[PDB]
């Protein structure tokens, strides 16, 4: 049975607009199979299409906004996009019908709307662009009964081991169609919707703008020679009309050039499903889904005070939609180095020059190939998975969709090697390469991550203790089903486990240094001059200069969280001899945090080098990673050491900003300085975790109780506020946000952990 509620995932996540980085398209979980991508442009001279369309994503002054306002994976959802430069905004309803052996039926609606300051009469070009992937699959565009191209209908039947045999339609769709009284209207015909049939290698196909152009060009090219010139030229929008070719091929153009508003379906019918999918079927199934949508809202997001009012439903909505309507399917090769050279031992002094070197040699080769199905950061910048990034989108997620979020936690587990590492950032298949300048492409093994992944198999855990709609709480509701995943799944937990206590150990036993156990102390590896990339707080202030002696503070509670994971989930399978060796070394972390990072002259925790003299300095930076212990529940709530630093965090004049908390105190000699990722400004992720912790001291019998219940209150209005306030503004998530002004600043489209809010806002953790 365990496999059948897994068979039933399979299918009914396999379809889904899993193509992120661009604006609009569709693709399966299946590696090389049937892609569809959405362009679209104004045309209003000779020239000007090239710099209009638009496929992939992007944020400038050209466009407003755009987003998901609801979205289930299972379902489907709808999106707007706000496009300045096109005078258009663009509505896409996706939506699926289940149905058949394949993993179901699809449709979908694209309507382009002219804003008030477009051209009544602006002309816009429309592409739908589809390709195949695979040897023994076939797609075939039924030709057309009318001369030049087609007055209605667009027919793709096609064909795959992977889909069995399906049929997509481009339907005739409302609107104006420009007519052009040209004497090239003789032989490429007045103006109609047209297609374009052809094939190029499989690796290529991916590469739509470039493939579209060449045919463009192509027909430009064809214009010149046969005498159509300056003297009496055809009007633009009839110069880019491709000529009608349909036929075979693993590449389908489908062009529409519409006068005013517009609107076409494409509907996608499983042969092995009932009957085909009709326009009809596409309105009421949208309709519904809209209604499942808000229902669960309600029930899974219930926003409490100061945030009942509507205005904040919306808000929450969309941080929501964004989240997890950014998931996208992966699939192609990485990029690592697996020389493992000596000198990312960093045992040396100067390690950073070592590791420099190695680095030069360039020994990193392409591998895999892989897929992964994840949730991203960012639309525009960042449509690729990250390790600990995961950890907090999932965590919104997994409230949604318990299975939905297991499936992503077991894909990217998938990814771990032999010796239990993941790749920090997973840039699988030329097309996720395209985006990412070079010098960041390669992995490294010897690069960790913050296990934020833990955080999301904790609240499982706890969930467990204590047809659509079925499936999303399947493995809650079904324990025998619940344990067998975390059984399948355990193994690689302790491997990554030991894989940290491996490679992330730092120097106790050679070095003028006590403490109630010799074993546990962790270090970075990664670290370079200024920036520590592996830990994630990148730019954070650490030890100078790097060196082999150093401890960090933050790792060292990360491995506590994992411990802590692992006991939980060894009773759940009875690993007695687990248990027990994970409860020494959970014993051990506690005492060794005490003894080899907590600052007394300081009352906050602190990392830890040698000196110009040989013996163990701590270094305190008052900021996030002082708080670390804290932050990952690590601390008992009758602690004194948890007082002192609900004393820092409190504190205006350090961290306690009107906007939340401050990556770092306004007392560092290091506040506001260089680039200033963690040097001062407001994160949610870290704030998410401060926020949790505060209310968990805040519901217990204990001396902190109405200390812990005042700050999260003004924690938690404080950070909803500054969110919602530069969304209103704005109509963006901000990776981070301004201690001194409030303004959200970086990257925008950032859902990406800055969706938390919406679990700050529903409260009960």
């Known amino acids: 049975l365990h496999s059948e509620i897994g068979r039933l995932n399979n299918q009914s996540l396999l379809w889904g607009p899993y193509r992120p980085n661009i604006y609009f398209g569709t693709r399966p979980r299946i590696g090389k199979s049937l892609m569809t991508g959405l362009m679209w442009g104004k045309i209003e001279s000779y020239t000007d299409f090239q710099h209009t369309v638009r496929y992939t994503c992007e944020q400038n002054e050209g466009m407003k906004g755009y987003g998901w306002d609801e979205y289930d994976p299972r379902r489907g959802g709808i999106q707007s996009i706000h496009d300045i430069q096109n005078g258009l905004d663009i509505t896409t309803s996706f939506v699926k019908i289940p149905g058949g052996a394949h993993g179901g039926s699809w449709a979908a609606r694209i309507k382009g709307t ?83 049939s052809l094939t190029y290698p499989d690796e290529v196909l991916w590469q739509a703008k470039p493939i579209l152009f060449q045919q463009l060009k192509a027909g430009i090219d064809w214009l010149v020679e046969n005498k159509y010139d300056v003297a009496d030229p055809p ?143 960012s639309r525009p910048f960042f449509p690729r998975g990250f390790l600990w990034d995961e950890g907090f989108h999932l965590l919104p997620i997994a409230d949604w969709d318990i299975d939905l979020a297991l499936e992503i936690i077991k894909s990217w587990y998938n990814l771990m090697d032999e010796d239990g590492w993941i790749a920090r950032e997973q840039i699988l298949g030329a097309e996720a390469r395209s985006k990412v300048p070079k010098e960041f492409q390669t992995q490294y093994p010897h690069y960790a991550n913050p296990p934020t992944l833990f955080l999301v198999l904790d609240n499982f855990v706890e969930r467990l203790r204590k ?57 970075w590896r990664g670290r370079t001059v200024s920036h520590c990339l592996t830990s994630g707080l990148d730019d954070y202030p650490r030890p100078q200069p790097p060196h082999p002696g150093e401890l960090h503070v933050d790792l060292m509670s990360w491995v506590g969280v994992m411990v802590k994971s692992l006991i939980s989930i060894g009773s759940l399978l009875g690993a007695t001899e687990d248990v027990e060796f994970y409860t020494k070394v959970l014993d051990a972390i506690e005492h060794n945090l005490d003894d080899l990072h907590w600052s007394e002259k300081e009352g906050c925790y602190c990392d830890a080098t040698i000196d110009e003299f040989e013996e163990h300095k701590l270094v305190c930076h008052k900021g996030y990673i002082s708080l670390f212990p804290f932050l990952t529940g690590l601390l008992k709530p009758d602690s004194p050491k948890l007082g002192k630093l609900l004393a820092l965090i409190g504190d205006e004049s350090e961290l306690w900003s009107p906007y939340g908390l401050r990556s770092l105190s306004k007392k560092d ?32 019998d204990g001396p902190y109780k109405e200390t812990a219940r005042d700050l999260y209150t003004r924690l938690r209005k404080n950070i909803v506020e500054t969110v919602y306030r530069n969304w209103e503004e704005t109509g963006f998530a901000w990776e981070q946000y301004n201690p001194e002004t409030g303004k959200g600043q970086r990257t925008q489209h950032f859902t990406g952990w800055t969706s938390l809010v919406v679990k700050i806002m529903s409260g009960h953790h």
């Open 467 to 523: 047809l659509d709609e079925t499936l999303s709480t399947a493995s809650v509701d079904n324990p025998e089903v619940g344990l067998e995943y975390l059984r399948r799944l355990y193994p690689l937990l302790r491997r990554q486990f030991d894989w940290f206590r491996k490679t992330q150990a730092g120097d106790i036993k050679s070095y003028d240094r006590e403490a109630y156990s010799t074993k546990e102390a962790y270090r």
């Open 669 to 700: 000699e290091f506040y506001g300085t260089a680039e200033n990722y963690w040097r001062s400004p407001v994160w949610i992720n870290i704030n998410y975790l401060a926020i949790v912790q505060l209310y968990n001291i805040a519901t217990q």
């Open 235 to 377: 009007p633009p929008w009839q110069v880019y009309l491709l000529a009608n070719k349909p036929g075979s091929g693993n590449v389908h153009i489908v062009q529409k050039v519409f006068e005013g508003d517009f609107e076409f379906d494409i509907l996608f019918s499983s042969e092995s499903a009932g009957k085909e999918v009709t326009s009809k079927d596409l309105e009421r199934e949208v309709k519904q889904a809209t209604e499942v949508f808000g229902e669960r809202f309600a029930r899974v997001f219930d926003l409490k005070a100061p945030f009942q009012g509507d205005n904040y439903k919306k808000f929450g909505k969309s941080m929501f939609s964004n989240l997890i309507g950014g998931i996208g399917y992966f699939y192609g090769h990485s990029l690592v180095d697996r020389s493992y050279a000596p000198e990312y031992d960093e045992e040396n002094e100067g390690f950073w020059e070592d590791a420099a070197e190695a680095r030069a040699r360039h020994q990193e080769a392409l591998e895999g190939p892989y897929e992964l199905f994840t949730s991203i950061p």
């Open 114 to 196: 002219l804003n008030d300051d477009a051209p009544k009469d602006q002309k816009t070009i429309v592409v739908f662009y589809v390709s195949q992937e695979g040897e023994n699959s076939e797609l075939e565009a039924v030709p057309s009964e009318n001369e030049f191209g087609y007055e209605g209908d667009v027919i793709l039947k096609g064909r795959s081991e992977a889909l069995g045999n399906y049929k997509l339609v481009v339907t005739k769709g409302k609107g104006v169609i420009p007519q052009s009284d040209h004497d090239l209207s003789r032989l490429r015909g007045p103006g109609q919707t047209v297609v374009q």
